[PDB]
């Protein structure tokens, strides 16, 4: 059989998918078993609710970096906290598996779910405004201009674990703000200083593309 | 603002494609001379050497795959000269070569492959060689009937030499590149954030504790 | 309500809001060559009882606590007797964690199971002959269970914030004072040693520190109850 | 399988039509959409 | 030799022996120089449905750079 | 027929299973006979 | 204790796979010069040369297989230079080459193969060449119509040279590697425990009789 | 601890007040509670 | 033993074994031996009593000479007999 060669011979593509000589022929590996906790794609991980490092500062050293303080010593109609929605950015998402995994890829798109959790007294009660402002804008000045957009209220005096669906994002970014709709109503004999947890994950509609390694690992190797 | 709206496909997100794209893990040097060197080189097969996929491998606990090794070589100078080498794989529980001309090189059960250096690099396919159903990157508990060393993660080792009785005055630097076929993971783990200190043990500095998310001014200012 | 098994009986609230670790129930070991050659014993009568460990005292500065299975049961009753006298072991677990607190206390705890939980050797000193590994007492705390030192890293070099991929559950002192997990056998080989290898490890960490008023109780009692499931032993050594 | 070569090996014709190794395997490009103003041949322009 | 392609949004190699050359996600191909020239196939890598040789309008959320 | 090569050429795996040119073609070996005491696997010995 | 419980497959236990994994049996040296050497080399085909498979071959009596020989070469120095060699096989009952340029090299019935030294090593396939139905590693009884020499185990021999009339000042060390195809054994034999003394005859030292199992203190103490 | 290894019950009287218990057998040292 | 010899030719083995014993004295003699197997992870028994509490057989070789025994499992300290 006469043939010819063409350009591409004797080259070694680090990306190409080809076989190689099985140097242990006839070998019999140890058979597999139904190990629970299997996976088939990292997207399964990206839709799991992790915690945001929302209190990113120089003054919080431990778990306090994850807890949004809230007190009655703040007034109503003022901004309590806020952040951006940008997983693969330098902010309070790098502690989140969505942000970690976005660092492992270039372009992502889809919808997200951000939830909040309250932990104070059972007897306490308040009302927080959770306002999302889509990108291309500035974070709201006051509660009023925020109420004129996609927002929810949250009377954590009754319903604790609250959620929220951010519609879209891709790759400035959208903002999420937490305002005191009221003051922290407090009964007698309770410290009246609580903490809010902020959790985040991706929805089903999320998708990833070209893979790239990450930068946060400054070490080349160890040995 | 190139805000994309189009759902991209999910094939790069699979663990299969997340452990593809063969890269390097090991580089060795081999100088041949008289009674002032070895004339050969031995390298134990390792995964956690270069810390980019150690992070991607600890992202789960239990894994199972087949390996595709490629051995490329050159002189420290860069030139490629017509010499015949010998790579040999050694399965676990087998004596390693102690000398250039020692007897282990003439061993049959030990597989080996002979190439020219002007030959395109060599490829080989290792199957799943563990006694267990899977590899365990974490084995809390002593292996005794010094701590946490997994009893079964040794794939074996490799040995490299040239085939000659003359001390060919030669200095090579061999690069390996590893591809993973038919990966199957289990039990995802959260990604490690702290830099390493030494291999095979997940220690960490309890003083220079790095934070996953960098620091900003306040919590009321996003950006 | 009330749950009675064997001779133990523990009350709780009515709930099917219970998590199945990775969505599979526990189960006995299927046909292997061991299952073919001999019958490993299947105790289901008395080793299955809701063991109630010593209460724990959560305070304003508490770090958190953890345990190791089955090491916590290695010296506890007939189960311990089966554990140190059979080098083959397999089981599932029902972990029912309760806290007993008033409505005037605040604080949030996280319950989570971790497979192959490995503790870290702190005290960085990169040296082969130093190797400050954690000692036998720490990595195998036993019945009482040790505490943490650096929770934000889980004393394992792993950030806590991403620790929810693990089968978890929130304990908030407002909504519920109890929770429950069910975990099957999690190992890459059907049997193993019950004494020198823990399959997984429970953790409890205060993610929102306890706080209260003048005149309140200063220490919340948190209890853990445990009940094995579909256990199996093999190879009676003397 | 024994074979032989013939003249034309290892050459690089600037005109020839052949494949090459897709260095981004499994990759998923951005799908196309019905962009108006399409063409299929320059003759359309010449008229 | 060593040719390596770098996808967009990825750091470029700054030195000969710098670490980017040892990068996995960065694809690369190793050949001999006495080897026939190398070939590779790049697919359509734009986020958009097509390339735009003209993008009148600023990319800001200095002119016309697609 | 245009083709290409890939890494793994001109190498000699001590483990690989391949044919080689039968240097005595058309040859006729001495035929086999039913020799008692045959084996097919060493496991027979180990029992 | 990694006490495995999983029945592994039986394919490595077959005699087929127990005589696979081509290894070496013969190494020869070939120096070419003037009237102070030979310029060629002859090697009789042998099995019991290297004592690792002699033990595996005496484990039975009667065997039948086809041989797959591979001839690899290099200079004693290690370099591979463009010279054309000549290997020739010689069937039994045929005269062996006595000189470099003697006439046997120009023989037709003697098969031969011509390669470059920069050519990948050569392969050949010898069939079952015995007159008998099988080889006999043991032939108690004189072959006369000095003792025990099997009348039919000579596969033939090999001869190596370079093709030139010039004394190419060259020093090579050629390694052969042998694979066995379609083995069929018979009549298993117990494995020999005593070291050898000379080839082809199973003698043994009746004074330094080694013991198969080493020595411990008593019989009432295992360990 | 050594008591938990026998016929026992728990009682979170923070929720369920009136608790009961059935002693299986007795006749005529005696059992303890 | 050919089992040990052949195990030397391989890394990992597993399965069940059969160990037998054979007596050679007088026809008129008689005794009783205890053949006790202690699985691995343990120490060999101190006395007959702690051995009788495990997989054991008796053997009155005064009547039945060629005795056998099946060891259930082994892989790769080890069990004792």
Numbering used by the authors:
A (entry chain C): 2 to 172, 188 to 239
B (entry chain A), G (entry chain A): 66 to 210, 220 to 297
C (entry chain B): 14 to 251
D (entry chain C), F (entry chain C): 2 to 48
E (entry chain A): 150 to 210, 220 to 224
H (entry chain C): 145 to 172, 188 to 192
I (entry chain C): 97 to 172, 188 to 192
The authors write:
Enteroviruses are unique in harbouring a lipid molecule (pocket factor) within a pocket in the VP1 β-barrel, which lies below the surface of a deep depression encircling each fivefold axis, termed the canyon. The binding of such receptors can trigger pocket factor release and viral expansion, leading to externalization of the N-terminus of VP1 followed by VP4 to form a pore in the endo/lysosome membrane through which the genome is thought to be subsequently released. Here, we have determined three cryo-EM structures following mixing of CV-A10 Kowalik strain with KRM1: the CV-A10 mature virus, a disassembly intermediate A-particle and the mature virus in complex with KRM1.
The expanded intermediate is termed the A-particle prior to genome release and B-particle subsequent to genome release. The previously internal N-terminus of VP1 now traverses the capsid from the region of RNA interaction, via the “off-axis” channel becoming disordered or cleaved beyond the last visible residue, 66. This recapitulates the externalization of VP1 visualized in Poliovirus and CV-A1625,26 rendering the inter-pentamer interface less stable and compromising capsid integrity. The A-particles showed no evidence of bound KRM1. These A-particles are unable to bind receptor and are ready to uncoat by releasing the genome.
